[PDB]
Amino acid sequence: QVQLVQSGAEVKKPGASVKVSCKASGYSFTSSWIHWVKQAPGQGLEWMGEINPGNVRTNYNENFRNKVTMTVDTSISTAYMELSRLRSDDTAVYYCTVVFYGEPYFPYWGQGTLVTVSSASTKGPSVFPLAPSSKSTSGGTAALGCLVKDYFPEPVTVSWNSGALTSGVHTFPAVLQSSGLYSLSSVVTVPSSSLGTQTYICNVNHKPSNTKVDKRVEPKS
Amino acid sequence: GCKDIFMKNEILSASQPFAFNCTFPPITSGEVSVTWYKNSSKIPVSKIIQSRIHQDETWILFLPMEWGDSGVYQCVIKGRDSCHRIHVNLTVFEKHWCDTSIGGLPNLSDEYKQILHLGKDDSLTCHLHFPKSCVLGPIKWYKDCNEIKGERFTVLETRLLVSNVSAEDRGNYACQAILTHSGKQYEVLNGITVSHH
Amino acid sequence: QIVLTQSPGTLSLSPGERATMTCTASSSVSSSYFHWYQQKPGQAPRLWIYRTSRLASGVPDRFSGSGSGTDFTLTISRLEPEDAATYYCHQFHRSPLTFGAGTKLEIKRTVAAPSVFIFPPSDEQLKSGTASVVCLLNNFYPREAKVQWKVDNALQSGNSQESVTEQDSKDSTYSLSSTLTLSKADYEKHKVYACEVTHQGLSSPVTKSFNRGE
Ligand SMILES: *[C@@H]1O[C@H](CO)[C@@H](O[C@@H]2O[C@H](CO)[C@@H](O)[C@H](O)[C@H]2NC(C)=O)[C@H](O)[C@H]1NC(C)=O
Ligand SMILES: *[C@@H]1O[C@H](CO)[C@@H](O)[C@H](O)[C@H]1NC(C)=O
Ligand code: NA
């Protein structure tokens, strides 16, 4: 099965450059065209260009002519997208896709890479439990969660029990605090009857600061 | 009382020399006359040899086929006391895979797929169908848009012989021929998706 | 450049209703090169309809595409909640490739009251010097809701932030967090921390409250 796995989010200062990777598997890497697609926050989709790992030909959207450089390392089936002389409007999610002969469309996508252009320094979040108790009860239902506070830039991801718990999960969009740092909560509703027996752990990831936190959320009296 | 025959599959071609032969056995094996039509039933395709599209013997010939040529084409076969009208869809695409993935082969029909059987001595075929007026030079072969060179690989006329087919012989191929017609030369480039299946 | 003009920008419809969106191209696009994608927040676009009218894998029959030359259409026969998303048209005909600006489909549903929960700050955070109080409004519709903070029955201002989720793919509801942030010292200067929720589906304003320490 065709897969594209992209590198993690990054923050970079204005004027610098960033290089996003796209690792491919499930097909003959040199028999394809890799495309890159830009999605600015709140905006739609913008096509940046294509590269053929076979003959290393590149065709760029001319709106990215002097901005983007596409390369490949075929020995590790990896495509690279480099942006130079970063400005604020380069802040966006970037996607790689792959196209096959006779199939002129995009069935396979990478998961996306958020690149933030900023002078502000990276900061990893603090993770605090949102303990289920009597004031988190509603018709045999308990709510619980994790507060992910004071990080920059976006994004953080939260999973529960390493991805085994997804039902009833709500991870809220970040808010911008007055400090200029972000904050979000991730919550879940579960049976109140089994708080004594089930284990709930939120897995928080903030790639730009290389933060990986697991927090067990335990009931309180 | 002309009986209409409809071709099953559409025919796809890059924007390059292209031809299609009006044939319908056993009728065309008799004494019949053949006339090609382009989106018409009243005005036939020209037989002026310098015309970009023209009829060449029983063939319709495009030198080259171009965007806008896509359509249903008809061949009217008249015998002494027989009439058959053959319908065929001819579709051109503009771009070649090694140049760009955009505006190219719109779907991967059986004519763009071939198979190389693992661990055996197999071959690929460069399918070139043209009236005898079109003289085909030697054929160059490409693998992922690079020219093929190797001891396992041998050019024999229209085929590419591959001895001891390996796992890595899968992928994208292309065969290239020079076509000479009426003193002028044209390039023919055909892509292939090859697998082991 | 072939510009794709997509309309309407936003669609708001009830389940079972018919949804229609169109894409108009500035130049003719061949039918084999015209496609639609579905994207839900936080996720990559998913191929949805390709070659004008073919359904991608996993796409239900209630979806259908049509069009020619410069005018293309995506139709959803009978809306389900999971159809809530942004849809993008796409041409693969001519460089540079281009996409429509998108059509965001919102699903209307019946009124649903929020379940309200309140969370005191963790001892871990208090040790740090700050107190965050989270009030949760879970699975409600519509999105309009009023959340007020009362501290020892005094109405608060200037110290809370709200965040609302996207529409839920299964039940079309919203959820909302409201977070009251205080320094440890200010937090310890008060007893009752309450959250007051007002919403269409509640006949009376619901309050979730707790006394500090308890
Ligand atoms: C192209 O099609 C024509 C039919 O119109 C083929 O020519 C006929 O072939 C049969 C048997 O091969 C003969 O009995 C007829 O006398 C031929 N007719 C004419 C007008 O030549 C021809 O063989 C086809 N060409 C190719 C390369 O397949
Ligand atoms: C030929 O083209 C027409 C479109 O005018 C279509 O109705 C018919 O199905 C096509 N036949 C094929 C592709 O075999
Ligand atoms: Na081709």
User: Does A141 lie in the same domain as A111?
Assistant: no
User: Does A112 lie in the same domain as A39?
Assistant: yes
CA distances for C177 relative to A89, A187, C161, angstroms = 30, 9, 8
Supply φ then ψ for residue B157, to 5 degrees.
55, -105
Domain limits, chain C: 4-107, 115-211
Choosing from B82, B101, B120, the residue where a domain stops is: B101
In the 8-state DSSP scheme, what is residue A137?
B
Q: Give, as residue ranges, everything with CB less than 5 Å from ion ligand 3.
A: B 96-97, 105, 191
For ligand 1, atom 22, the nearest C-alpha belongs to B23
Ligand 3 centroid to residue C94 C-alpha, Å: 15
Choosing from B35, B68, B101, the residue where a domain stops is: B101
DSSP H/E element including C128:
helix C123-128
Question: How far is Cα C57 from Cα C111, in angstroms, rounded to an integer?
Answer: 34
User: Does A11 lie in the same domain as A105?
Assistant: yes
Q: How many residues can be counted in chain C? A: 214
Place of tokens 């009124």: C111
- CB nearest to B107's CB, from C32, C93, C95: C32
User: Does B143 lie in the same domain as B129?
Assistant: yes
Say if the Cβ atoms of B102 and C51 lie within 8 Å: no
Supply φ then ψ for residue A130, to 5 degrees.
-115, 90
**Residue type for position B44:** P
Alpha helices in C34-122, H assignment, sequence order: none
User: Does A130 lie in the same domain as A101?
Assistant: no
Choosing from A59, A87, A117, the residue where a domain stops is: A117
For chain A, the straight-line distance linking the first and the last C-alpha, in angstroms and rounded, comes to 49
CA distances for A110 relative to A6, A21, A26, A160, C45, angstroms = 6, 10, 13, 22, 10
Say if the Cβ atoms of C44 and A106 lie within 8 Å: no
User: Does B47 lie in the same domain as B134?
Assistant: no
- CB nearest to C177's CB, from A110, A131, A185: A185
Question: How far is Cα A145 from Cα A170, in angstroms, rounded to an integer?
Answer: 9
The two three-digit tokens of residue A146, written as one number: 């994790």
Sign of CA dihedral A22, A26, A30, A33: negative
User: Does A142 lie in the same domain as A76?
Assistant: no
DSSP H/E element including C211:
strand C206-211
CB A22 within 8 A of CB A80: yes
User: Does B179 lie in the same domain as B155?
Assistant: yes
Question: How far is Cα A88 from Cα B117, in angstroms, rounded to an integer?
Answer: 53
Question: How far is Cα B100 from Cα C33, in angstroms, rounded to an integer?
Answer: 14
Residue numbers of the domain that contains A144: 126-217
> Which chain A residues contact residue C208 at CB under 8 A?
135
Measured between CA atoms, the residue of chain B closest to residue C32 is: B106
**Residue type for position C188:** E
Given the CA of residue B9, which atom of ligand 2 is nearest to it?
A: 14
- CB nearest to B171's CB, from A31, A55, A57: A31
Select the CATH number that applies to the domain covering C115-211 from these four: 3.40.50.300, 1.20.58.1610, 3.90.1300.10, 2.60.40.10: 2.60.40.10
Select the CATH number that applies to the domain covering C4-107 from these four: 3.30.930.10, 1.20.1250.20, 1.10.150.80, 2.60.40.10: 2.60.40.10
Question: How far is Cα C183 from Cα A191, in angstroms, rounded to an integer?
Answer: 33
User: Does B130 lie in the same domain as B84?
Assistant: no
User: Does B68 lie in the same domain as B39?
Assistant: yes
CA B156 centroid distance within chain:
19
The two three-digit tokens of residue A42, written as one number: 């709140």
User: Does A211 lie in the same domain as A138?
Assistant: yes
Say if the Cβ atoms of B103 and C94 lie within 8 Å: yes
User: Does B110 lie in the same domain as B38?
Assistant: no
Query: Over the Cα atoms of chain A, what is R_g?
Result: 21
User: Does B94 lie in the same domain as B2?
Assistant: yes
User: Does A31 lie in the same domain as A98?
Assistant: yes
Question: Is cis: bond before A153, omega within 30 of 0?
Answer: yes
Question: How far is Cα A107 from Cα B138, in angstroms, rounded to an integer?
Answer: 38
- For chain B, the DSSP string reads -PEEEE-SS-EEEESS-EEEE---TTGGGSS-EEEEEES-SSSPPP--TTSSEEEETTEEEETT--TT--EEEEEEEE-SS-EEEEEEEEEEE---TTT-STT--SS--GGGEEE--TTS-EEEE------TTSEEEEEEEEETTEE---TTEEEETTEEEESS--GGG-EEEEEEEEEEETTEEEEEEEEEEEE--
> Which chain A residues contact residue C214 at CB under 8 A?
none
CA distances for B122 relative to A39, A67, C50, angstroms = 46, 46, 35
Supply φ then ψ for residue C31, to 5 degrees.
-65, -25
- CB nearest to B102's CB, from C32, C51, C95: C95
Distance from B103 to chain C by nearest Cα, in Å?
5
In the 8-state DSSP scheme, what is residue C141?
B
Which ligand is nearest the CA of B36, by number? 1
Q: Provide CB contacts within 8 A for C51, sequence distance 6+.
A: A105, B106, B107, C31, C32, C33, C34, C35
User: Does A88 lie in the same domain as A10?
Assistant: yes
Measured between CA atoms, the residue of chain C closest to residue B92 is: C30
A15 Ramachandran zone, left/alpha/beta (phi>0; psi -120 to 50): left
Choosing from B79, B101, B123, the residue where a domain stops is: B101
Distance from C34 to chain B by nearest Cα, in Å?
11
Choosing from A99, A117, A135, the residue where a domain stops is: A117
As to burial, measured by CB atoms within 10 angstroms (0-12 exposed, 13-18 middle, 19+ buried), residue C38 is buried
User: Does B58 lie in the same domain as B133?
Assistant: no
User: Does B96 lie in the same domain as B51?
Assistant: yes
Q: Which of A33, A106, A113, A137 to mutate to test the interface with C (most CBs of C within 10 A)?
A: A106
Place of tokens 């779907």: B107
Distance from B171 to chain A by nearest Cα, in Å?
5
Number of domains forming the structure of chain A: 2
Residue among B23, B133, B136 whose CB has most ligand 1 atoms within 8 A, to mutate: B23
The dihedral formed by the CA atoms of B126, B197, C32 and C85, expressed in degrees to the nearest 10: -160
Q: Which of C136, C175, C183 to mutate to test the interface with A (most CBs of A within 10 A)?
A: C136
Sign of CA dihedral A84, A113, C40, C75: positive
Question: How far is Cα A62 from Cα A59, in angstroms, rounded to an integer?
Answer: 9
Measured between CA atoms, the residue of chain A closest to residue B14 is: A102
CATH code of A212's domain:
2.60.40.10
Question: How far is Cα B69 from Cα C33, in angstroms, rounded to an integer?
Answer: 17
Number of domains forming the structure of chain B: 2
The two three-digit tokens of residue C157, written as one number: 């201002």
* Cα angle A75-A76-A81, degrees, rounded to a multiple of 5: 110
User: Does A57 lie in the same domain as A87?
Assistant: yes
* Cα angle C132-A183-A117, degrees, rounded to a multiple of 5: 155
User: Does A138 lie in the same domain as A72?
Assistant: no
Residue numbers of the domain that contains B47: 1-101
Choosing from A92, A117, A142, the residue where a domain stops is: A117
User: Does B24 lie in the same domain as B96?
Assistant: yes
Domains C4-107 and C115-211 share a fold: yes
Question: How far is Cα C161 from Cα B17, in angstroms, rounded to an integer?
Answer: 67
Summary count for chain A: helices (H), strands (E): 0, 19
- For A72-112, the DSSP string reads EEGGGTEEEEEE-S--GGG-EEEEEEEEETTEEEEEEE---
CB atoms within 10 A of CB B9: 10
User: Does B10 lie in the same domain as B97?
Assistant: yes
User: Does A104 lie in the same domain as A9?
Assistant: yes
Tell me the technique behind this structure: X-ray
DSSP H/E element including C126:
helix C123-128
